[PDB]
Ligand binder design. Structure first.
Ligand code: 4KU
Ligand code: 4KU
Lengths: 514, 514
């Protein structure tokens, strides 16, 4: 019962520490195997590229005040610290879209009001630290028990769908950069090149298909058990290596490759330095902003809380075989304090990543080798340790001095890897199965509790409600009011706890929503 | 059994006619369904393109004396006649590689000895007719009982492997004429075009994958049974239509398309006419060639007999549920007489096609709708009728006046269709399963009679012997002694009936070889 209120200050944090910290030698010892290496290799590529993309976008939006190096430094430091001190070291911290939206809006507000951007960020971080400490002190992390699988399913489905849509847009943009033309006259990124877009499509599809086939090969009967396990562990590294070699063999055509800033330096050394004075560099900071910086701190707190808590709820589900423990009080305090302290150095705030953490947990899941003939395998154990997160964060940080190797890796292989990750992420959601059940006839439905105890027409209405909520949420972030997305997401708890029982019966709700 | 000798002249032919001909109204009536349309649409494309390819090759080899229109006319006429009068109307007649080799060798011999080519072909055809009549009269078609599944599996495996290899050398060739170049300066088939090879590869892979996925969709649970059956029947037409539409949407890039001669005319109207005088056109024909034309007739008879009889053996296997009957005496007489009469008009000889007939039978197989969960589907029936062959031959003949539609179909879609056909053809051979069994561990082998009653190491030796025979046969036709391939193939019957019992036991041979 980690969500029970004790009535004493710092009680939940004390319970979390006392529950988790004794297992530390086990955490250090569990990581000696070959699956951890494959997980590290996969998740390092899964985590490095979003840093580059969001650093480029941030540099575009904030006129070069924050760039790629800032995001890389923040990711490395925060990930290392959280993995070393967290109670759930299987979470992956990084930048996300809502944080980018908030940063852009805050930059617009600061520019409109003739204020300094980084000093305002500093005071926002300080107020966020104060608010997070106050919230943790009052055991405010017990509201998580009010978050039903309704909201969790909606959030996960929307996040994975958005992830998938963005990979396809970045391929489309390749083809508009390099259209297929009848004539290519002979001649600052290259433009209007032949054989580029089709080769990128081929590389993406090949990487995806090799990864899928090697994943399917695990449950076959060919070769020995040890060889099957080893080959299935390293399916994604094998796909990446094979497609990189295929791309390297062809030396006539231009393909876009990974680029990283070289050296540890700020993006714009003339405009700013590493340390941001809290009282102002060129102008005094007015005290009224010093006082009024609480509201953006409140918005950041709401964003970080909702994201981290929903991710922690999804990761620690009972069907996923999580044993060593869970952290609902320590992780929030760690993330909030580190984010608030990051403001003094002009570094962006971070949160828990949903797709990356889910993929990290999936990569470490061990299935039973005694697979029943013609039966779906079941989870044997999940390996819990602290080495993988530290190694991933260290590699992300050290990627700055490893640009020579990274310049040989095309982006289409990473596009295929992202497609594989997004497709795999959608298979662990009950909404996916209840959406597949719509196409099949009613006489072929499995023996799930929401099939036998609920009428067929009364079960499809729940799925329709969830789909409508997801569509409304996507429509709202598409527009310019995307800053109100978290409030709209938290609004689904009153909907389930006040309006849903008025339509459905308690028995139906107990089986459908569990 | 139809393989028993009666002791009277024309006894086997009389028995075959009396067994098969009463079912004629059933043969005409069985064709009223939707699967026949899909089979016709698939096999028409399966049959038309080899005529074009072999017509081009024949025109190259014979200096334009025989071309594409001659092959089309021969295919149409012989197919229509055989389907109307045959006892096994599920066979598909057409040109093959061995026939091309014989024609090239005969042309070389005629050129070296200063003789006319078509008159020699006329006399070869007449001697072939005489030999076929003599062989059929003496009940010589009872030697087919000495052809064990050893030879049948060897032949089928080799033929399918060659088919697949040739589909990948015509894409390699497609890439070779259109290499990927850094620069494409603007400047008789087009050459050195951009975006052609990669687009052809994409079209091939897309057609193959759509066909495979739609074939897999048959055994799923989505949608109703009727919709599943209808969609699975038309998987290959749907793949072809979708990929043709995709290619048509892109109008910037050059792709090679189907071309057919227009009008009904001889390839070289100046050199020859439709009728070949048997006494000589420009020079008298020496009687010594008139007498000595028996040996090439013997070679042609051996080739046609072996190919047609092996194909008929493979098609009429007991596991394939053939009911209306089989023809071992009527089909040989029909094919031999029609081929011999074809010589007078300067048309090439035809034989039964293995891959095309196997695909034709597979396309008309009906599987039981009561599919057991987690179990292989069972064959319910095979639709035996005469309409499909007549329609396919008529369409092949009429394709001359339908070039406008045919010019919009790229060849890469057909390459993908050929790959699908070749892959599907290899799944009905026991050698395929016994070759898959090598990779799997000995504790996972099924309960087939060649597993339980034979030691594991003693069964792998039979597969090695078969593979060595196949490799030797392929090596022999690669070289210039490919005219002796049929003799080498028939040499495998003494090997099985004289040498194999000296090594294996009676029980081992009975279990391993049917
Ligand atoms: O976070 S994602 O990995 O899906 C992502 C990937 C790319 N490119 C390939 S790494 C580009 C953008 C995104 C995230 C886009 C996004 C997601 C959620 C929200 N919520 C807004 S309240 C907003 C965005 S936004 O950046 O398009 O505004
Ligand atoms: O008969 S096939 O459909 O495999 C074929 C197809 C193509 N091109 C695409 S339709 C080209 C050639 C062939 C057949 C080649 C062949 C097959 C068997 C033999 N054995 C007789 S000794 C010989 C040949 S050959 O034409 O290469 O000599």
């Amino acid at each position: 019962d980690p969500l029970l209120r004790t009535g004493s200050v710092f009680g939940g944090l004390v319970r979390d520490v006392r529950r988790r910290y004794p297992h530390y030698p086990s955490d250090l010892r569990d990581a000696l195997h070959s699956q951890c290496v494959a997980a590290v290799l996969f998740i390092y590529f899964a985590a490095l590229s979003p840093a580059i993309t969001f650093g480029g976008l941030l540099g575009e939006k904030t006129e070069g005040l924050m760039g790629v190096s800032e995001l890389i430094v923040s990711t490395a430091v925060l990930g290392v610290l959280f993995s070393l001190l967290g109670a759930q070291p299987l979470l992956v911290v990084g930048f996300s879209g809502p944080l980018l939206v908030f940063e852009e809006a805050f930059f617009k507000f600061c520019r409109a009001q003739d204020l300094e951007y980084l000093t305002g960020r500093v005071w926002v971080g300080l107020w966020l630290v104060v608010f997070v400490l106050a919230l943790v002190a009052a055991e405010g992390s017990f509201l998580v028990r009010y978050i039903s699988p309704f909201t969790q399913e909606i959030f996960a489905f929307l996040i994975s769908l958005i992830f998938i849509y963005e990979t396809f847009y970045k391929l489309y943009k390749v083809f508009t950069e390099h259209p297929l033309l009848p004539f290519y006259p002979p001649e600052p990124s290259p433009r209007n090149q032949p054989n580029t877009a089709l080769l990128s499509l081929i590389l993406m599809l090949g990487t995806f298909f090799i990864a899928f086939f090697l994943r399917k090969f695990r449950n076959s009967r060919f070769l020995g058990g040890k060889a099957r396990r080893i080959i299935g562990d390293f399916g994604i590294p094998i796909s990446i290596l094979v497609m990189v070699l295929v791309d390297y063999s062809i030396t006539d055509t231009y393909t876009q490759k990974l680029t990283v800033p070289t050296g540890l330096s700020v993006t714009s050394p003339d405009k700013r330095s590493w340390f941001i004075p809290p009282l102002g560099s060129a102008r005094p900071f007015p005290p009224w902003m010093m006082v009024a910086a609480a509201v953006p701190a409140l918005l950041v707190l709401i964003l970080i809380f909702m994201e981290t808590q929903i991710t922690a709820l999804i990761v620690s589900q009972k069907a996923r075989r999580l044993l060593k423990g869970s952290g609902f009080h320590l992780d929030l305090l760690l993330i909030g304090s580190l984010g608030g302290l990051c403001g003094l150095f002009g570094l962006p705030w971070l949160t828990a990543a949903t797709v990356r953490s889910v993929t990290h947990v999936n990569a470490l899941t061990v299935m039973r080798t005694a697979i029943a003939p013609g039966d779906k395998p079941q989870i044997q154990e999940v390996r819990e340790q602290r080495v993988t997160g530290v190694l991933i964060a260290s590699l992300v940080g050290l990627s700055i001095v490893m640009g020579a190797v990274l310049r040989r890796i095309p982006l289409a292989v990473l596009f295929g890897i992202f497609l594989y990750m997004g497709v795999t992420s959608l298979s662990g959601i009950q909404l996916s199965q209840r959406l597949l059940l719509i196409l099949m006839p009613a006489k072929h439905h499995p023996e799930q509790p929401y099939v036998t105890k609920v009428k067929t027409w009364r079960m499809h209405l729940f799925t329709c409600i969830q789909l409508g909520c997801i569509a409304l949420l996507w429509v709202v972030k598409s527009t310019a009011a995307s800053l109100a997305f978290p409030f709209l997401l938290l609004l689904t708890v009153p909907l389930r706890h006040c309006l849903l029982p008025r339509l459905f019966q308690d028995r139906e709700l107990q089986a459908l929503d569990s």
